[PDB]
Design a protein around this ligand. Structure first.
Ligand SMILES: Cc1cc2nc3c(=O)[nH]c(=O)nc-3n(C[C@H](O)[C@H](O)[C@H](O)COP(=O)(O)O)c2cc1C
Ligand code: SF4
Ligand code: SF4
Ligand code: SF4
Ligand code: SF4
Ligand code: FES
Ligand code: FES
Lengths: 66, 54, 430, 41, 59, 212, 230
């Protein structure tokens, strides 16, 4: 109420712990006591694209611009 | 300074007219240059003694 | 083997250079067209490909890819997708008039050759792309197509046998890039003229997705003559890799600048003076010689007095042979100014697919401006050398490469005029 | 032959290219279609 | 080249020299800079709040 | 050269613009050449018809071509802004293209540029305070083997000199048009020495061939 | 049974037929730097960044649109691969204006990150630096078209997902203005999704425009509303 800042009563608000595997993450979280929510890893899906398919003859995949 | 602009920031003339030096200035002061992994130690002679840093 | 080769009469592949006896299919029959072509067609396209590789046709337009390998890639077994033949007829490399003469005085041998190429590889229709600068010559081509149709001998069921073959004509809209190998293909497609990527070849995916190919007009013109004439009669004029006749033209600085057919090799001094008037001011007046046109490095005086006019010879001279502007230029013109105007041309006509040709021709245009005004340092001329090493081959097409090469030739040969120009600018400002 | 066998080019009017394309439209094999009539149908 | 008052500058007969490009708060090693930025009715990007904590400022 | 439209009426659709039914039959011949399934390939010949009908194309012409070929207009705007033969600025009857790059400028095009400039009056690239003299210098056209060249509406002029400049411009003022071909004799692209080309009447199909 | 052998600097891996060099290089972890390729769209090649020296070839070729013959070896860390990356990154920053303070992609540029990690340091090209004046595309999307690197990603996005066909290339050479020719305020669905497509600071959010720069703001998982898909 004097400067327009965001104070907090949260010492733990600026923790982050970058790990390398989900197993050690869950093991450390269960080791140190508190609860935890696991979201699963999502890779980009591999696709099938080609420039010749962008220059189709009777397929509708057509670049239409260039 | 060193002539390796990806570690030391360039000076003002090339900074105000470059492109690579402005980019290096910008990201070098925002992020900080990346440092390869590993553990080093060194020590020099402070007037007290072995000023070591690990 | 010939002693460097020259023109012997009636060994001209095509007569009627200009304004001769008539302009008609009857005149084509008198000059040697529509003669015994059905017996050539009904023997099998493998024999036509054997005849062409017997002649050993070097590909024209200043590329180097031989016609036999290309049309042997064109022997794919026919699927549900048809095959197309595209006759390219633009004239880049400013200084050209290569096939302007051919399409202005003899379209009939072009009709013969596109029929031969349509039979020889399984093609079905031929689109002929004329430059947009050529409305009157295009209408002459339309009159010739009307005459060939009105004979009732092409179109549907050609030569009396059950073989239809249609030919169309698409105009240009004015470009250098529409002459190239694949921007042609997409300019026919109605999209704006932009080259594709090369490892999908035009012989696999082409005009909308069909196995097509693109032939130069000189290849179309020479193609029925090799079919109707003997094997390797064409190949006896010059060396073994390159073989036959070519249009060597001086469009530029000589007295009576003009065009001559010759064989594959020629002594250059006989070529310049003993056929086309004389050099403006004598042989020792010219500063240098550019062969090829505009996608070729220069050749100075002490190199042009001795070097013969072969493709392998200009590979040995680190250049590339093209057509019709195998010209000299005088000391009275500044070659820096001439090459800078050529770089301005390169900026004015180039598409914007690739980043490096775009920005490299941008820097080279502004830097050649700063060289004509002379406001730089020698580190700048070596920087122009470094960027001309950077650009070359890192693009899609060869317009970036053909913008790299004149800068290369100017730096390899004419350093001292640049140094004196910059020294005179230092004397001017100081 | 040292006589200009052309001037057959000289009479060319500004419509003749489209005139020749107009008149030579017959014996046209059907320019093969592909699925839809257009990229957007 | 003494380091004192933390003053601002402005253009010759012109507006505020700052853009609010947040570099000073990105580098401020005690985070004493506090920038909240908004553009005004003109269109050039500017600020709302540019605060220096004189306690945290190590100079 | 101001590649955004910015209407300025005498533009600003709808400008009233329509063709001739004979030209509609030309349109049907044009989209009857190209195969079914790829109607969008005839954009450049239809737009060429629009230019040859009305000397420069307005934006309502591009809307018309888009509605005829049932395409979105943006491809028509791309093809209009991409090429060289289509001048979106209004021009006059005759159009002057002074071509000068590599043999043309190096064979002294600047005399022709000075002659055109101090004969016509208006500067290079600009237009004239009448019709029929829209002057631009241009890059290469192909017809290189002679003096630096002039293109007027589907016609060429080679082997120039400033008295020929005066003659051709005064006769386009009068309306009588000279030949597309070369000048100074040499009735085609000729070796203009002692006729170093072929002289004999060629035999053709008569002499020795093989497998024919 | 439908496999292709490539060596990524010696490390063998198998490639499905028809795919690209780039998907296999991203399969082994090597992110070849890219500007025009993006996996939600078709494959252009106009940014030229993905050049890589593939062996027994004097010419260095693109990796977003290369068919994969059997038995490659792909040299990513060679000499002239780095030289081509230095050259291309030096070409991009020539006609790009000094707007990295007043840009809105300071923390989230692509020229900045890839020109640190791949480019040169001492610039060149002393004079020049043309500029293209902006347009008015829509009051929801703030648009500066001097920073457009002409990469042809928004155009492919329009013509292949939006289907609206209002953005196009105009001109030749250096002068390629990308946009709508006719002073039309481009308003359609998913026009808010073009500010995430544009890799450089040329198409930013209009209402967000100048409130923060993205290192201060922390990122948090949540689920969408107002649509039943989330
Ligand atoms: C930079 C460049 C410019 C070209 N200019 C022309 C041209 O003006 N006219 C033309 O017919 N072909 C032109 N081409 C294409 C070549 O002539 C090419 O060789 C042709 O497609 C096939 O010729 P060839 O089969 O006889 O080798 C050009 C190609 C390139 C790379
Ligand atoms: S090198 Fe230049 S002109 Fe050639 S395809 Fe690439 S962008 Fe187009
Ligand atoms: S935000 Fe900070 S670094 Fe940026 S202009 Fe303002 S005072 Fe300078
Ligand atoms: S506006 Fe952005 S996405 Fe579109 S071409 Fe330009 S840089 Fe690429
Ligand atoms: S997009 Fe351009 S102006 Fe913006 S941060 Fe990146 S390099 Fe700077
Ligand atoms: S340069 Fe003038 S016509 Fe080719
Ligand atoms: S990513 Fe392959 S060229 Fe843009």
């Amino acid at each position: 109420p004097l400067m327009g800042w965001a104070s907090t009563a949260d010492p733990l608000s600026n923790l982050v712990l970058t790990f390398s595997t989900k197993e050690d993450a869950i093991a450390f979280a269960e080791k140190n006591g508190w609860s935890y929510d696991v979201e699963e890893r999502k890779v980009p899906k591999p696709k099938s694209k080609s420039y010749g398919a962008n220059f189709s003859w009777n397929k509708r995949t057509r670049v239409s611009t260039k | 300074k060193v002539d390796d602009a990806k570690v030391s920031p360039p000076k003002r003339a090339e900074m105000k007219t470059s492109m690579e030096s402005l980019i290096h200035h910008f990201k070098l002061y925002t992020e900080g240059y990346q440092v390869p992994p590993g553990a080093t130690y060194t020590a020099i002679e402070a007037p007290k003694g072995e000023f070591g840093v690990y | 083997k010939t002693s460097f080769g020259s023109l012997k009469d009636e060994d001209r592949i095509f007569t009627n250079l200009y304004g001769r006896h008539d302009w008609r299919l009857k005149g084509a029959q008198s000059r040697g067209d529509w003669y015994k072509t059905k017996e050539i067609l009904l023997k099998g396209p493998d024999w036509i490909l054997g005849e062409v590789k017997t002649s050993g046709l070097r590909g024209r337009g200043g590329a180097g890819f031989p016609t036999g390998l290309k049309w042997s890639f064109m022997n794919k077994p026919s699927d549900g997708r048809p095959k197309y033949l595209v006759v390219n007829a633009d004239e880049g490399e400013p200084g050209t008039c290569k096939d302007r003469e051919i399409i202005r005085h003899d379209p009939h041998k072009l009709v013969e050759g596109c029929l031969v190429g349509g039979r020889a590889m399984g093609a079905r229709a031929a689109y002929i792309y004329i430059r947009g600068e050529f409305y009157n010559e295009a209408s002459n081509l339309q009159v010739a197509i009307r005459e060939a149709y009105e004979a009732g001998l092409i179109g549907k069921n050609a030569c009396g046998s059950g073989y239809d073959f249609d030919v169309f004509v698409v105009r240009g809209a004015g470009a250098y890039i529409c002459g190239e190998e694949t921007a042609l293909i997409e300019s026919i497609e109605g999209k704006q003229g932009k080259p594709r990527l090369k490892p999908p070849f035009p012989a696999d995916v082409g005009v909308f997705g069909c196995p097509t190919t693109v032939a130069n007009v000189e290849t179309v013109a020479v193609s029925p003559t090799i079919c109707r004439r003997g094997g390797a009669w064409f190949a006896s004029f010059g060396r073994e890799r390159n073989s036959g006749t070519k249009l060597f033209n001086i469009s530029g600085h000589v007295n009576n600048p003009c065009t001559v057919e010759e064989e594959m090799s020629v002594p250059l001094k006989e070529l310049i003076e003993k056929h086309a008037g004389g050099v403006t001011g004598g042989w020792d007046n010219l500063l240098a010689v550019i062969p090829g046109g505009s996608s070729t490095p220069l050749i100075p005086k002490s190199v042009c007095e001795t070097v013969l006019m072969d493709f392998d010879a200009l590979i040995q001279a680190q250049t590339g042979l093209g057509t019709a502007a195998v010209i000299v230029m005088d000391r009275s013109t500044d070659i820096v100014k001439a090459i800078a105007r050529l770089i301005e041309f390169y900026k004015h006509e180039s598409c914007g697919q690739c980043t490096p040709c775009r920005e490299g021709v941008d820097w080279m245009n502004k830097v050649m401006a700063r060289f004509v005004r002379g406001d730089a340092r020698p580190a700048e001329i070596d920087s122009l050398w470094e960027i001309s090493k950077q650009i070359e081959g890192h693009t899609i097409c060869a317009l970036g490469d053909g913008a790299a090469w004149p800068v290369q030739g100017l730096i390899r040969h004419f350093r001292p005029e640049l140094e004196e120009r910059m020294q005179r600018f230092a004397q001017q400002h100081q | 032959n040292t006589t200009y066998k052309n001037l057959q080019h000289h009479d060319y009017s500004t419509y003749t290219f489209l005139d020749l394309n107009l008149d030579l439209s017959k014996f046209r094999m059907p320019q093969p279609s592909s699925g839809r009539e257009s990229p957007r149908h | 080249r003494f380091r004192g008052e933390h003053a601002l500058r402005r253009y010759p007969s012109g507006e505020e020299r700052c853009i609010a490009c947040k570099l000073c708060e990105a580098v401020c090693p005690a985070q004493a800079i506090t920038i909240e930025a908004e553009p005004r009715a003109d269109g050039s990007r500017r600020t709302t709040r540019y605060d220096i904590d004189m306690t945290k400022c190590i100079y | 050269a101001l590649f955004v439209h910015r209407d300025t009426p005498k533009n600003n659709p709808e400008t009233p613009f329509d063709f001739t039914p004979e030209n509609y039959k030309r349109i049907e011949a044009i989209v009857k050449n190209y195969p079914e399934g790829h109607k969008a390939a005839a954009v450049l010949p239809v737009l060429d018809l629009a230019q040859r009908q009305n000397g420069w194309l307005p934006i309502s012409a591009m809307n018309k071509v888009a509605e005829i070929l049932q395409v979105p207009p943006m491809r028509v705007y791309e093809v209009a802004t991409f090429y060289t033969m289509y001048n979106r600025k209004p021009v006059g009857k005759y159009h002057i293209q002074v071509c000068t790059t590599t043999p043309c400028m190096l064979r002294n095009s600047d005399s022709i540029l000075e002659a055109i400039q101090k004969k016509l009056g208006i500067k290079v690239g600009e237009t004239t305070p009448d019709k029929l003299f829209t002057l631009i210098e241009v890059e290469c056209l192909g017809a290189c083997v002679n003096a630096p060249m002039v293109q007027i509406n589907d016609n060429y002029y080679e082997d120039l000199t400033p008295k020929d400049i005066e003659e051709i411009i005064d006769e386009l003022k009068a309306g009588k048009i000279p030949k597309p071909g070369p000048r100074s004799g040499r009735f085609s692209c000729e070796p203009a020495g002692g006729l170093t080309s072929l002289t004999e009447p060629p035999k053709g199909p008569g002499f020795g061939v093989q497998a024919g | 049974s439908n496999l292709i052998e490539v060596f990524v600097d010696g490390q063998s891996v198998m490639v499905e037929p028809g795919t690209t060099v780039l998907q296999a290089c991203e399969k082994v972890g090597m992110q070849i730097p890219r500007f025009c390729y993006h996996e939600r769209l078709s494959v252009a090649g106009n940014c030229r960044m993905c050049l890589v020296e593939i062996e027994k070839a004097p010419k260095v070729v693109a990796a977003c649109a290369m068919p994969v013959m059997k038995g490659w070896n792909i040299l990513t860390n060679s000499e002239k691969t780095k030289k081509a990356r230095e050259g291309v990154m030096e070409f991009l920053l020539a006609n790009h204006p000094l707007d990295c303070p007043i840009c809105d992609q300071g923390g989230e540029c692509d020229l900045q990150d890839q020109s640190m990690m791949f480019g040169s340091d001492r610039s060149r090209f002393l004079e020049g630096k043309r500029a293209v004046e902006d347009k008015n595309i829509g009051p929801l999307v703030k648009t500066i078209m001097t920073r457009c690197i002409q990469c042809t990603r928004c155009i492919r996005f329009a013509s292949e997902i939006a289907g609206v066909d209002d953005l196009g290339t105009t001109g030749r050479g250096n002068d390629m203005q990308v946009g709508t020719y006719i002073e039309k305020m481009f308003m359609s669905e998913l026009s808010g999704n073009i500010i995430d497509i544009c890799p450089v600071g040329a198409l930013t959010s209009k209402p967000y425009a100048f409130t923060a720069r993205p290192w201060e703001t922390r990122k948090t998982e949540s689920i969408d509303v107002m649509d039943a898909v989330g």
